[PDB]
Structure 1
């Protein structure tokens, strides 16, 4: 027996070292989703142009690692739905991404910070 609850949560990805919107925000669907499944919380988000996202790690503001799983690597849509393990009360994630766009020889590693519109809630 398991139980799951979800609700939308919006967010903005911002540039390393500022609050300016990052280019990364344009490559993710909005809003995302908070899921609670058997008293574990996840932030679920969808990566657009998924083939460009070669690596993506998430951390909390204290540098703890946040396990990231892939729900659906949708090759037909070129999207990727991922779950990031979070805790209620988190307000922002640090992300470290490796983006590769082979046809323009673009191969970059970035740090950004993903700011939730409001802290991750407790769900019933």
Structure 2
């Protein structure tokens, strides 16, 4: 296995309640192994709304992210977040701007994997 699907749910700051941020990421994501390193690849819908995003492990280490696909037409963006096997969540901090309802906000949420990122290959 070079990769495997991994489902997740983005949940609200301070609880296990689903966050409506979950509605703007494709499901499942994917765990990808390259050489000795692991990536969580995920697709952001309504990419133009995500003005900033940072991901952290549960020990508050910022995780490197790369853009691997920007699709202007579909308004999506595919990103690779650096992870390790064993992570059960990521903390996200995002700056979201929604024109139609004049919204400009920063939020913190926690993305919860269906299970610990597995070792592969």
In structure 1, which of residues 55, 72, 75 is the aligned counterpart of residue 69 of structure 2?
72
Runs of at least 4 residues off by over 3 Å = none
Residues 71-95 of structure 1: per-residue CA shift (max 9 Å, x gap): 1111111000000000000000000
User: Any gaps of 5 or more consecutive residues in structure 1?
Assistant: none
Displacement of 1:102 after TM fit? 2.1
Displacement of 1:105 after TM fit? 1.2
SS of structure 2 residue aligned to 1:18: coil
Displacement of 1:17 after TM fit? 0.1
Displacement of 1:38 after TM fit? 1.2
Displacement of 1:101 after TM fit? 1.1
Displacement of 1:103 after TM fit? 3.1
Displacement of 1:21 after TM fit? 0.2
CA–CA separation in structure 2 for the residues paired with 1:69 and 1:54: 15
Residues 32-51 of structure 1: per-residue CA shift (max 9 Å, x gap): 00000111100000000110
TM-score, with length taken from structure 1: 0.95
Residue number in structure 1 paired with 2:13: 16
CA–CA separation in structure 2 for the residues paired with 1:73 and 1:109: 22
